[model samples]
Target: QTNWQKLEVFWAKHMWNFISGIQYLAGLST
Candidate 1:
């Protein structure tokens, strides 16, 4: 359960990073 929770948080943070990265990349490209 601990590992799962940790992984879930990791992915959530990672996904936010990915989303922000894409958003910034698009903003810069435009």
Candidate 2:
């Protein structure tokens, strides 16, 4: 795969995880 394509997928994968974790953060931060 090309460099840009590889990084784009990787970024979205982790970004998705980071976005999803907001639920846990707010839920537990209380």
For residues 3-23, what per-residue lDDT tens digits would candidate 2 score against the true structure? 999899999999999988997
Where model 2 places Cα greater than 4 Å from the true spot, the runs are none
Model 1: lowest-lDDT 10 consecutive positions: 1-10
Error of 2 at 6 (Å): 1.1
lDDT, residue 3, model 2: 94
The local distance difference test score of each candidate is 0.92, 0.90
Q: lDDT for model 2, please.
A: 0.90
**TM per candidate:** 0.72, 0.57
1-30: candidate 1 lDDT, tens digit per residue: 679989989999999999999999997985
